[PDB]
Design an enzyme around this catalytic site. Structure first.
Site, PDB file in Angstrom:
ATOM      1  N   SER B  12       3.220 -20.472  24.094  1.00 26.19           N
ATOM      2  CA  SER B  12       3.586 -20.750  22.692  1.00 26.19           C
ATOM      3  C   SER B  12       4.884 -21.554  22.534  1.00 26.19           C
ATOM      4  O   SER B  12       4.908 -22.586  21.839  1.00 26.19           O
ATOM      5  CB  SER B  12       3.695 -19.440  21.918  1.00 26.19           C
ATOM      6  N   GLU B  32       3.127 -25.518  34.114  1.00 28.91           N
ATOM      7  CA  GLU B  32       2.407 -24.281  33.822  1.00 28.91           C
ATOM      8  C   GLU B  32       1.644 -23.852  35.074  1.00 28.91           C
ATOM      9  O   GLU B  32       0.835 -24.612  35.591  1.00 28.91           O
ATOM     10  CB  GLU B  32       1.443 -24.528  32.657  1.00 28.91           C
ATOM     11  N   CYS B  40      -0.579 -15.871  24.219  1.00 24.21           N
ATOM     12  CA  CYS B  40      -1.230 -15.795  22.910  1.00 24.21           C
ATOM     13  C   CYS B  40      -2.662 -16.296  22.914  1.00 24.21           C
ATOM     14  O   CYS B  40      -3.572 -15.610  22.432  1.00 24.21           O
ATOM     15  CB  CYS B  40      -0.432 -16.559  21.864  1.00 24.21           C
ATOM     16  N   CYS B  45      -2.689 -12.759  21.232  1.00 20.91           N
ATOM     17  CA  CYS B  45      -3.055 -12.812  19.817  1.00 20.91           C
ATOM     18  C   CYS B  45      -4.501 -13.245  19.545  1.00 20.91           C
ATOM     19  O   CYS B  45      -5.185 -12.612  18.766  1.00 20.91           O
ATOM     20  CB  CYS B  45      -2.163 -13.789  19.029  1.00 20.91           C
ATOM     21  N   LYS B  48      -7.281 -10.914  21.126  1.00 23.49           N
ATOM     22  CA  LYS B  48      -7.039  -9.602  20.505  1.00 23.49           C
ATOM     23  C   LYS B  48      -7.659  -9.594  19.107  1.00 23.49           C
ATOM     24  O   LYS B  48      -8.366  -8.641  18.741  1.00 23.49           O
ATOM     25  CB  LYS B  48      -5.537  -9.300  20.459  1.00 23.49           C
ATOM     26  N   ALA B 173       2.913   3.652  23.913  1.00 25.33           N
ATOM     27  CA  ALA B 173       3.244   3.932  22.515  1.00 25.33           C
ATOM     28  C   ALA B 173       3.474   2.696  21.656  1.00 25.33           C
ATOM     29  O   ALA B 173       3.729   2.828  20.452  1.00 25.33           O
ATOM     30  CB  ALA B 173       4.483   4.810  22.474  1.00 25.33           C
ATOM     31  N   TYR B 175       2.684  -1.371  20.120  1.00 27.10           N
ATOM     32  CA  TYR B 175       1.646  -1.934  19.279  1.00 27.10           C
ATOM     33  C   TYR B 175       0.433  -2.411  20.081  1.00 27.10           C
ATOM     34  O   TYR B 175      -0.675  -2.411  19.565  1.00 27.10           O
ATOM     35  CB  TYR B 175       2.201  -3.051  18.404  1.00 27.10           C
ATOM     36  N   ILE B 176       0.634  -2.809  21.338  1.00 25.16           N
ATOM     37  CA  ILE B 176      -0.471  -3.279  22.173  1.00 25.16           C
ATOM     38  C   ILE B 176      -1.463  -2.135  22.404  1.00 25.16           C
ATOM     39  O   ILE B 176      -2.655  -2.284  22.138  1.00 25.16           O
ATOM     40  CB  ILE B 176       0.042  -3.939  23.487  1.00 25.16           C
ATOM     41  N   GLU B 179      -3.256  -1.260  19.115  1.00 24.94           N
ATOM     42  CA  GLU B 179      -4.277  -2.228  18.739  1.00 24.94           C
ATOM     43  C   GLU B 179      -5.530  -2.131  19.604  1.00 24.94           C
ATOM     44  O   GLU B 179      -6.663  -2.122  19.083  1.00 24.94           O
ATOM     45  CB  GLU B 179      -3.740  -3.660  18.827  1.00 24.94           C
ATOM     46  N   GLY B 260       5.001  -1.608  28.169  1.00 25.87           N
ATOM     47  CA  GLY B 260       6.092  -2.570  28.108  1.00 25.87           C
ATOM     48  C   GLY B 260       5.840  -3.768  28.996  1.00 25.87           C
ATOM     49  O   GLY B 260       4.986  -3.734  29.900  1.00 25.87           O
ATOM     50  N   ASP B 307       9.365 -10.650  20.256  1.00 26.41           N
ATOM     51  CA  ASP B 307       8.247 -11.123  21.048  1.00 26.41           C
ATOM     52  C   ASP B 307       6.994 -11.404  20.221  1.00 26.41           C
ATOM     53  O   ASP B 307       6.020 -10.632  20.254  1.00 26.41           O
ATOM     54  CB  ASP B 307       7.935 -10.123  22.153  1.00 26.41           C
ATOM     55  N   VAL B 340       2.489  -8.315  11.604  1.00 24.07           N
ATOM     56  CA  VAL B 340       1.242  -7.621  11.293  1.00 24.07           C
ATOM     57  C   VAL B 340       0.728  -7.030  12.631  1.00 24.07           C
ATOM     58  O   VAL B 340       0.735  -7.706  13.665  1.00 24.07           O
ATOM     59  CB  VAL B 340       0.182  -8.513  10.603  1.00 24.07           C
ATOM     60  N   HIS B 437      -5.618  -8.372 -10.364  1.00 17.51           N
ATOM     61  CA  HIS B 437      -6.546  -7.235 -10.390  1.00 17.51           C
ATOM     62  C   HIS B 437      -7.992  -7.695 -10.290  1.00 17.51           C
ATOM     63  O   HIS B 437      -8.353  -8.676 -10.948  1.00 17.51           O
ATOM     64  CB  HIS B 437      -6.346  -6.498 -11.707  1.00 17.51           C
ATOM     65  N   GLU B 442      -1.827  -5.949  -5.535  1.00 18.29           N
ATOM     66  CA  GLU B 442      -1.148  -5.664  -6.794  1.00 18.29           C
ATOM     67  C   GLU B 442      -0.297  -4.410  -6.745  1.00 18.29           C
ATOM     68  O   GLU B 442       0.648  -4.280  -7.508  1.00 18.29           O
ATOM     69  CB  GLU B 442      -2.118  -5.556  -7.966  1.00 18.29           C
TER      70      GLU B 442
END
Ligand SMILES: Cc1cc2nc3c(=O)[nH]c(=O)nc-3n(C[C@H](O)[C@H](O)[C@H](O)COP(=O)(O)OP(=O)(O)OC[C@H]3O[C@@H](n4cnc5c(N)ncnc54)[C@H](O)[C@@H]3O)c2cc1C
Ligand SMILES: Cc1cc2nc3c(=O)[nH]c(=O)nc-3n(C[C@H](O)[C@H](O)[C@H](O)COP(=O)(O)OP(=O)(O)OC[C@H]3O[C@@H](n4cnc5c(N)ncnc54)[C@H](O)[C@@H]3O)c2cc1C
Ligand SMILES: [Cl-]
Ligand SMILES: [Cl-]
Ligand SMILES: [Cl-]
Ligand SMILES: [Cl-]
Ligand SMILES: [Cl-]
Ligand SMILES: [Cl-]
Ligand SMILES: [Cl-]
Ligand SMILES: [Cl-]
Ligand SMILES: [Cl-]
Ligand SMILES: [Cl-]
Ligand SMILES: [Mg+2]
Ligand SMILES: [Mg+2]
Ligand SMILES: [Mg+2]
Ligand SMILES: [Mg+2]
Ligand SMILES: [Mg+2]
Ligand SMILES: [Mg+2]
Lengths: 451, 448
Positions: B12, B32, B40, B45, B48, B173, B175-176, B179, B260, B307, B340, B437, B442
């Site tokens: 990225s 690379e 990603c 990302c 996933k 524990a 987010y990975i 998810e 981690g 990250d 998110v 609405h 809202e």
């Protein structure tokens, strides 16, 4: 025998009336609310709520038939019961009646089931008895206009649509507004052979051109039949239990139902306004100032009956602010009707706030307007053959590139708009958007990464 | 050879910085060692989100269709086809990224670079030099460090799967783990989620960590708190048993962990430079992405700040604007970056947690608004999933310093709110914005 006295009488138990009554009651006012039909008004019973439920059902059917294979699923819809869908929808609406009644109870609101009519400047009559208050809110909303052609008794307005308990195999929607656009997409997504007929080259003429173009394009690609430049002439019932709608251009469509959305009219007829100093415009809408004051001190109006912006949140905010002003000393408080965001539940949905491209060019001139335009395939569609596009536009004015309009059509835009509406209301520029770090992977990030 | 700019890492940050430099006329070399697009695009990302979408689709079909009048049968689910299609899309992305690099005249070498001097690197036995060198090498998963660790899969191992385990234990524990656990659970796996402390997602607002667990538990995921992994053993029946320090043991078909990541600085040859690393191996940088050595810069996961992909991208782009387009004072602000998390339902967050706000400003200056409701989407069925929102306001003016939500659609709601919060939005700014609405969004502008 003497007139029963209240601090506030609210005529209409819809979006505006409920909101205003509750807020007045919260501030200690002795409030009377009058509703002749059902609590919750249009939005709860035959508007936003049932419309959204049906949209959700139609979107679910579309996802299952078209997008599941790409994700490795072999799916079969063994049966779809439109009747059960309607029964569940109506059971939810009944639940909402209970929720609204509990809210009214919590604010000590007294209610009457019946239709009110003014008999004096500060007095109304309902079910034989007179009631008076120094403050009276007209929040009577509106109702559908008639189709106005021979055989109209065979057509259905939006109320008729919600009364349906079985889905027509073939249906023709008549009208160019958001209601016809939304309902057409709903029955089409649910499997009806759907025709959408409107009077000019394009429908949704008050929307930004990108949006009117794309709503039609997206619907056309999925199989809806579009009939532009179509003015209805008559509807005929045939001997074979079906209808034929003919247009002035000579084209005809054989169908099981005709649903029309050709405008609404305000509920001011037979309200007894001749007994007040309340003035109406030529269309029957109640004239108001920025504070929702009618032309008579002591009578106010909010919601669809004023003919400004016919949306539930507008009626609610206007009603709440009015009660704050009258009963909580917020003497200068009023609702700003500029930059109100709108979502239209087409397939996919539309999001819009502020000026259209044409209106911006007219107001500021070509030299002062810069348009940012993006078109991309949402990742949701990356595994299938159908590559639905999402289209976005930002309209910026001056050197500073102040955002005066934001429009989008695509999956998920219905939930993306609220936050951007806040930023635009605050005077956001292109730089403000650009300096906000994107959220990946989402459709929403495309609004802050336009070049 | 000599270049104006050498970028180490084609992920990225590296791609973004290299393209922007080439766009401004720099002669750029990008190196690379694995796959273009980095974490990603290949194992982050993108895949996933694809798997999360499939998971959400299956949950919807099995649980929410009846309420809308549909009798639906998932005749077959091919995880193999899902992965084939996902990888076909990622191959398309490789092609698009390569076309972008070509358009900006970026030269690329496939191999792993190691510094040999302050402005010189080696790759495939050949040396290259440039007065500006970007370290954008990212990070990699840590190891479990227990007996039987070789039987478990890290997130790279998860994306290498072409078939799903029937029973699975997620360890970690962050987010990975959160998810991925939701993804396999929604796709039908008997799923367990085990973490060391009382609750997971400890860096998130307490409302978010609590509700992620509650929402998952309600849908049948088995939660194991206070569970420190001890060992993994393979049984004679080709299944695994993972045992924790508390005595719990779970028989399963796979163990997937996210405990981690560590920065890719250990094999980089930094001993041949003046680039300093912190105690965890992250490259130390100033606000302009400068390392402690002039001529070497760093962006992305390798700096151990935030990250996320858009952060790496923006840091890389702005760095190139500064170095090659004369934007001397340009830098990336790392405050108020929105996030998110694709749990089921998703999590949206920006700004301070309630505890961080309380600690920073004090109880008498903080006001919290909370909302909890059932999205209308769930109104026709038996399962009434909740959506929970929180606004954290500071001072008399009630400036918004944190915004948090968990519920359907919050993944698409956050971006606009982030713009407003970055602009210094107050509760009054939200209140003065007319609601839309009917939407879940809202509720953010109608809290009292
Ligand atoms: C099909 C459809 C879909 C819609 N979708 C959306 C949407 O998605 N989002 C959105 O924001 N808006 C939507 N709207 C618009 C929204 O429903 C209206 O803007 C809103 O209901 C207006 O509220 P109100 O209080 O002005 O009027 P209403 O909600 O119509 O309430 C007026 C009430 O007053 C009663 N009444 C009338 N005269 C009298 C009398 N003399 N005495 C006693 N009671 C009386 C009526 O029975 C009625 O209940 C939709 C409308 C329709 C028709
Ligand atoms: C499972 C998972 C899910 C994620 N989901 C999200 C999400 O939803 N949203 C989000 O914003 N972020 C997400 N991330 C984070 C995002 O992937 C990273 O923040 C981002 O990829 C970091 O970019 P980077 O350029 O720093 O490193 P990378 O993308 O990791 O790129 C570094 C590259 O350098 C190469 N390399 C390393 N050392 C050398 C060397 N010596 N020579 C040559 N090449 C080398 C590597 O092969 C790699 O391709 C996720 C991460 C994971 C693991
Ligand atoms: Cl209310
Ligand atoms: Cl029309
Ligand atoms: Cl336009
Ligand atoms: Cl209409
Ligand atoms: Cl780029
Ligand atoms: Cl853990
Ligand atoms: Cl965490
Ligand atoms: Cl907290
Ligand atoms: Cl991890
Ligand atoms: Cl979800
Ligand atoms: Mg009913
Ligand atoms: Mg009239
Ligand atoms: Mg070159
Ligand atoms: Mg080992
Ligand atoms: Mg199963
Ligand atoms: Mg080495």
């Amino acid at each position: 025998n003497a007139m029963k006295t209240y601090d506030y009488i609210v005529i209409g138990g819809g979006s505006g009336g409920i909101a205003s009554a509750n807020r007045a009651g919260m501030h200690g006012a002795n409030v009377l609310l009058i509703e002749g039909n059902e609590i919750g008004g249009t939005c709860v019973n035959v508007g936003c709520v049932p419309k959204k439920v049906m949209w959700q059902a139609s979107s679910m059917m579309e996802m299952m038939e078209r997008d599941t294979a790409g994700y490795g699923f072999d799916v079969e819809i063994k049966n779809f019961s439109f009747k059960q869908l309607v029964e569940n929808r109506e059971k939810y609406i009944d639940f909402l009646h209970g929720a609204y009644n509990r809210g009214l109870d919590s604010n000590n609101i007294e209610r009457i089931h019946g239709y009110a009519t003014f008999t004096g400047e500060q007095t109304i009559e309902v079910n034989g008895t007179e009631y008076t208050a120094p403050h009276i809110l007209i929040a009577t909303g509106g109702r559908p206009k008639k189709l106005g052609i021979p055989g109209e008794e065979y057509a259905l307005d939006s109320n008729g649509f919600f009364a349906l308990e079985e889905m027509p195999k073939r249906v023709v929607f008549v009208g160019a507004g958001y209601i016809a656009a939304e309902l057409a997409g709903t029955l089409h997504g649910l499997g009806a052979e759907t025709h959408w007929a409107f009077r000019h080259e394009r429908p949704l003429r008050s929307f930004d051109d990108m949006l009117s173009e794309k709503v039609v394009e997206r619907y056309q690609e999925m199989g809806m039949q579009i009939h532009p430049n179509a003015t209805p002439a008559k509807i005929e019932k045939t001997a074979q239990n079906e209808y034929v709608i003919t247009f002035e251009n000579g084209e005809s469509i054989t169908t099981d139902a005709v649903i029309f959305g050709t405008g609404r009219q305000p509920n001011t007829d037979q309200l007894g306004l001749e007994n007040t100093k309340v003035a109406l415009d030529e269309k029957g809408y109640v004239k108001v100032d920025k504070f929702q004051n009618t032309t008579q001190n002591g009578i106010y109006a909010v919601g669809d009956v004023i003919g400004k912006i016919d949306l539930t949140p507008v009626a609610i905010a206007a009603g709440r602010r009015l009660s704050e002003r009258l009963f909580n000393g917020q003497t200068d408080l009023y609702l700003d009707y500029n930059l109100v965001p709108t979502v239209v539940f087409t397939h996919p949905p539309v999001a819009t706030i502020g000026l259209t491209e044409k209106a911006a060019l007219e107001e500021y001139g070509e030299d002062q307007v810069k348009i940012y335009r993006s078109s991309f395939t949402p990742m949701y569609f990356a595994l299938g053959e159908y590559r639905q596009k999402c289209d976005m536009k930002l309209i910026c004015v001056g050197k500073e590139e102040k955002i005066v309009g934001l429009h989008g059509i695509g999956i998920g835009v219905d939930e993306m708009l609220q936050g951007f509406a806040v930023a635009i209301k605050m005077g956001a520029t292109k730089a403000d958007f650009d300096n906000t770090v994107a959220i990946h992977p989402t459709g929403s990030e495309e609004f802050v990464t336009m070049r």
